Amino acid sequence: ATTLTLQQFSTVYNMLSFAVASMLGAFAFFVMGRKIVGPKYRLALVVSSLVVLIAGYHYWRIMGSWTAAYALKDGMYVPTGEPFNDAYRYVDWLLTVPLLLTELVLVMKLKKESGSVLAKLILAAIAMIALGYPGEISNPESQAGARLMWGVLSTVPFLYILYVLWVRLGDAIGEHPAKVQVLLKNTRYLILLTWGFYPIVYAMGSYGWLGGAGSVVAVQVGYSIADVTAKALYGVMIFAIAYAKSEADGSLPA
Amino acid sequence: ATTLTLQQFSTVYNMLSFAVASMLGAFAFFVMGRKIVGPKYRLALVVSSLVVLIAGYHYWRIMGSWTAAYALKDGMYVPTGEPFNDAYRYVDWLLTVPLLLTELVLVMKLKKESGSVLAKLILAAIAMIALGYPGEISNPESQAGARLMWGVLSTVPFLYILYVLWVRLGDAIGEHPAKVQVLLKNTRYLILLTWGFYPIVYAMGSYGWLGGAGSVVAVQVGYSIADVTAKALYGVMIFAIAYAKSEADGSLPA
Amino acid sequence: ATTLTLQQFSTVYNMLSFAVASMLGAFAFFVMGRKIVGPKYRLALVVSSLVVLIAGYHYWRIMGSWTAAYALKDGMYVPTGEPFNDAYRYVDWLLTVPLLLTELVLVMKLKKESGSVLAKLILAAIAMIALGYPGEISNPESQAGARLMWGVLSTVPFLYILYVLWVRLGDAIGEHPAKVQVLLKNTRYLILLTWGFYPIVYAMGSYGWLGGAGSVVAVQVGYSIADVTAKALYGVMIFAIAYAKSEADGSLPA
Amino acid sequence: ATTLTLQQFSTVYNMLSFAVASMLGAFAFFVMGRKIVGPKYRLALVVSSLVVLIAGYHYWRIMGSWTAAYALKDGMYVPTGEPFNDAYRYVDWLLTVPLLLTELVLVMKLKKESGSVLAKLILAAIAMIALGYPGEISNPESQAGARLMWGVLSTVPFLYILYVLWVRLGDAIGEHPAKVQVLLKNTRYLILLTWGFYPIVYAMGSYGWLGGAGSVVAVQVGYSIADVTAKALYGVMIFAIAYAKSEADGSLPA
Amino acid sequence: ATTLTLQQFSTVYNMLSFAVASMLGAFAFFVMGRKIVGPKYRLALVVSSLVVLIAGYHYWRIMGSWTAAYALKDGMYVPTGEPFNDAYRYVDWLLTVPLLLTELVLVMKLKKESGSVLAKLILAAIAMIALGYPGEISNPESQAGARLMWGVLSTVPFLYILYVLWVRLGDAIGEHPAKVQVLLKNTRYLILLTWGFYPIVYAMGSYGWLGGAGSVVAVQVGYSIADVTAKALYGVMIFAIAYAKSEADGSLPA
């Protein structure tokens, strides 16, 4: 593998520590702020906490992996041979991606067919991660065909999730007040922006653009930014929607 | 022992980390969602949390064992001589298996003879694990007779547990509304499917089919899947039954 | 010291891990089930949690000691020279034994002289452990006289505790309903059975019967069984008595 | 790097441990004292806890770094070559500085334009830390120009934050009773005093005054004092303002 | 430094572990028993928890230091050269000593000038520890003058604290019922007895009486006993006073 300078290793280490601290803070906030909203939305906040808890644990492992993957030697960071690859992140995703959609459904309080919509979204998310995993461990050079096939098969449930978010949930969003509608539309925009990061990284790794110390650093920093935005800030938006709906129906504990 | 490739070791490590994260998330969810159901069912949820807490600790140990059982050497994972065997899992089972049945009884609110049914189930579960343990540490080649005898003796309380689940608890299940009856029958199906995994693994290890890196990987992955399904998803079903019964009697805090 | 086989070391390690998991589960259960009983008994449950918390920490240390006391070498476990002896357990006992009696008094709600009875029991327990400690560190061969003297002096407060349990607390037990009387008598029987284990181990170590790998394994397994029964199951019985008394006076939150 | 005497290393280690203990105590206090004030201010206290939680984690890392940066050798502490620099602290600041201002807004209960003021302050704080980071990793000798430019660009949002604190928030402060006005003015004075420490350290590092064991020790001790005062004591003042306002409107739970 | 026998090292290690377990148990008890007293006294209990939490963390460090300060070699414990001295304890004291007095004021509910009395006591405690620290790191042989001067300057605020405890707080104590007066006087006696331990150890270290393995062991055991009595048992007395005052005014939740 490529050698890293002190600054490159430090940048990746700092961004991983930032992700760990963000998940710990988000967990504390969701647990304690569950009591601030009406009792009807607390379940949704519970799920938010689970997400930032799981990712938190996983990031604590990833950080430990990163330190173990390099050794300091003559003012350079030289790979030790201990593995460090994105495949481990899939273990996080298979739990967090289905839970994320779950909280969005829970806070929405769908009047009809809530169970069927939630079940189909959870199945789509699980299938997306499960089909993505075999392509990720495929070597982009020796096994390009397998990587392309698995990525294309993984994109189908991703498109189904986007369709359900923008087409089915439109009519449910339209039944909320203006404040709640703005918050829900902003939450949907935050999914689209953050979730496309992962397929783009997969595609760049398929075309062999991720070689080099620069690319290695950028991908880890992008993972930390994307995970924090898609989990902690996403849960904060869920909390904001729950608080607004509690204020609308007069169920706010304050 | 057999040497592992990078992918085989990574697969086992990732599945163990997945089990740890699943137990931690389940624990947080049961603790926080205890307040979402009526006060009559909270004790049941408490027991659910205990299960996912205990298994969680144990999986954190198993993961640590797995890393200690192999060393990276010339792009292969070579056994270090530190032990790694299924016997340690029995220490988990002796607590979790009696507790699992316990929560199913607690959420059911048996009108008569609840204590006697629960006591007999707990004794059956303890006896099953206690008789299974001597056969597991029996060498399948030198001590085949002892392994067969202990497995057969362990299966008797297993059959008694299945009989009590399907024959005694039928009349109690029939006294619930349709939603609760569907949830209880699905919970019983989830026990039968997940619990048979363990005796099948024991029997395959008795016939010498578990040699080889492939079998080693498959058994650990199957253990992680079976444990997560039989503890975290099982507790989620217990939570669903408690929520449905709270909604039926008008005791839902919301 | 004697060398251990793989199975002997594994058995001791598994029993220590079992004790750790049991104390962690008991702690979670007592903390969460405090809200299930009436407010008059919650203090008693609090003390229960403290016991299983303290022992839990101590067992986490003992486990760490055991691994450090032996090294794997030619398929045998050879002592490293790092100490491992029962004296460390006394540090646990000096806190847990006075607290155990405390919870039994607290749940009992003595009408008169509760303070004096509790104070005398706490002083007796402290004196018992404090007089036992100098005899334990006495070499059974070179310092037999000192060991005998300290054990005999330690037994006097033990007999006083048994006398107070069976003679003073008889009249208080007789003032409870039949269910509560059965639970209290069973709790008293559980003390007598579990508490005699420790003096028997001390006496066997005084007569030089504890040499050999078999004896070493048996004593650690017996310590784990006795501690779990005398702390976690004892607290569960305290919880059962509190729940029964809450149901009797109509103070049950459910 | 310069060698440290035993006393210099010990002083830095003790001050880091002090910061860790202070953040842990502050976290426990804010979590438990949230229930002591009226429900209208609890959200503010929640944010306080998040701050002392995040910094706590980060200080636990910094302490671990410091021990790793030196080795004991011939009664002197000699640098090992493992890095130890202030850049890691920026990862803490980017979360804590926006949250600190947040709690001050939350406890204040701005009647109009609360959202816009809070958003502008959060953006200013993020920009301040983000522009400060490139100058900190700039070598003060080889890259003086870049360090000066980044520091000057970082000071603009700092001045905007001070202006908003003293000019916009004046009219809001004037609408509180005398006790609350005194507490708010003291809180504003505590920001000005503690926050200027960081730019002064940056400027001293730009002029090359931070060489030498004395300067190294003083800067770490100053960081610990400044962080504890600006986070734990600042949150205690937030708690005092919340308690005073709860007492003023008769919402105190006691 | 002096070599230790197995028993001397074991005694110090066991007493440090005892202090850790005592602080953890005290923390759990204060957190859970806060709900058992009236809402007017809960803040006081919160502060109690903070004390036993901080000391707990610090003792976990001290224990780790002690193990690191010696190595097992030929059945003796030989110093490794890693430092172990009392100066680190001052980092604990500077937080815990001001908090201890704080809880005593908080539970007392001073009718007039509570703020001024508490502020003066906190300032006196901080000054006492801050003036003690420079004398502790003074070598008792080469720097006897500095040690004497710093100790004498540290004793002045100690005498002021004792004067405030016995002279100002007399009239406030006289306004409580007989039970509360007895508890307050016993709490004052527990301060005087436990707090004089520290200056006596300082004075003995000034006269060179602390050399030798015996003295080394005795001082650590005395520190553990004094800290446990002055923090955990002191908080238990605070809890007893709060419970008695809750029972007196009819604010007991039970």
Ligand SMILES: CC1=C(/C=C/C(C)=C/C=C/C(C)=C/C=C/C=C(C)/C=C/C=C(C)/C=C/C2=C(C)C[C@H](O)CC2(C)C)C(C)(C)C[C@H](O)C1
């Ligand atoms: C191509 C390819 C693949 C797959 C690639 C994939 C799936 C890529 C996915 C990329 C996506 C979905 C990117 C999405 C980006 C969306 C953007 C940038 C959306 C922008 C929206 C904004 C900024 C809206 C702004 C706002 C508006 C308009 C209204 C609001 O009120 C306020 C505000 C939020 C500012 C594989 C995986 C099959 C492998 C193969 O080898 C290559």
Ligand SMILES: CC1=C(/C=C/C(C)=C/C=C/C(C)=C/C=C/C=C(C)/C=C/C=C(C)/C=C/C2=C(C)C[C@H](O)CC2(C)C)C(C)(C)C[C@H](O)C1
């Ligand atoms: C043989 C042997 C041994 C023991 C082996 C043992 C005990 C094996 C145990 C295996 C068992 C009990 C397997 C059980 C499998 C059960 C299955 C596959 C059940 C399937 C049920 C389904 C899929 C139901 C589906 C559903 C239905 C029908 C209705 C619901 O509403 C909806 C839905 C859940 C889809 C030893 C231990 C003595 C050692 C010896 O050397 C060898």
Ligand SMILES: CC1=C(/C=C/C(C)=C/C=C/C(C)=C/C=C/C=C(C)/C=C/C=C(C)/C=C/C2=C(C)C[C@H](O)CC2(C)C)C(C)(C)C[C@H](O)C1
């Ligand atoms: C002799 C000796 C020493 C000391 C030894 C000591 C103190 C030994 C202590 C042993 C004791 C106290 C043993 C106690 C055993 C008690 C038993 C086995 C009690 C049995 C009770 C049962 C099983 C009751 C059963 C039940 C009944 C009867 C009614 C209930 O409703 C239902 C049920 C629980 C089943 C030293 C320490 C001085 C050193 C010296 O060198 C040697």
Ligand SMILES: CC1=C(/C=C/C(C)=C/C=C/C(C)=C/C=C/C=C(C)/C=C/C=C(C)/C=C/C2=C(C)C[C@H](O)CC2(C)C)C(C)(C)C[C@H](O)C1
């Ligand atoms: C110059 C320079 C830079 C930047 C430096 C900067 C931004 C320095 C910042 C320093 C600041 C803002 C210092 C502020 C100090 C403020 C003080 C000391 C305020 C004192 C207030 C007190 C003590 C008030 C006392 C009170 C009063 C008056 C009323 C209250 O009721 C009671 C009490 C609190 C006692 C860079 C970053 C561009 C790099 C370049 O190379 C050099």
Ligand SMILES: CC1=C(/C=C/C(C)=C/C=C/C(C)=C/C=C/C=C(C)/C=C/C=C(C)/C=C/C2=C(C)C[C@H](O)CC2(C)C)C(C)(C)C[C@H](O)C1
């Ligand atoms: C001398 C010296 C220094 C300083 C030394 C210092 C400050 C020493 C301090 C020692 C102190 C203050 C010791 C205090 C001891 C107090 C005792 C023993 C109090 C006893 C009270 C009891 C036992 C009361 C008992 C009770 C009574 C009377 C009524 C209650 O209702 C029930 C009960 C608690 C039993 C330095 C630091 C300047 C350095 C220099 O080189 C040497």
Ligand SMILES: *C/C=C(C)/C=C/C=C(C)/C=C/C1=C(C)CCCC1(C)C
């Ligand atoms: C918190 C973590 C999140 C939101 C992770 C999201 C991950 C994805 C949306 C992954 C998508 C993929 C595809 C659409 C196809 C290529 C393979 C994947 C798994 C990278």
Ligand SMILES: *C/C=C(C)/C=C/C=C(C)/C=C/C1=C(C)CCCC1(C)C
């Ligand atoms: C969470 C863990 C669970 C549910 C473990 C379940 C384990 C069993 C059902 C084990 C059964 C066995 C037999 C029926 C006979 C052979 C020996 C055993 C112990 C593997």
Ligand SMILES: *C/C=C(C)/C=C/C=C(C)/C=C/C1=C(C)CCCC1(C)C
């Ligand atoms: C949870 C731990 C428990 C209940 C420990 C109990 C320990 C004893 C009852 C010890 C008793 C002893 C004697 C009666 C005399 C000999 C010395 C002792 C300390 C082993």
Ligand SMILES: *C/C=C(C)/C=C/C=C(C)/C=C/C1=C(C)CCCC1(C)C
């Ligand atoms: C708890 C941590 C706190 C409050 C950190 C505050 C940090 C600053 C106010 C930093 C300010 C800076 C400038 C004004 C310019 C030079 C660069 C900075 C980042 C040191």
Ligand SMILES: *C/C=C(C)/C=C/C=C(C)/C=C/C1=C(C)CCCC1(C)C
């Ligand atoms: C929990 C820890 C406690 C109560 C520590 C108390 C410490 C003291 C009272 C220290 C007193 C000292 C003097 C009076 C003069 C000599 C220097 C000191 C710091 C040892």
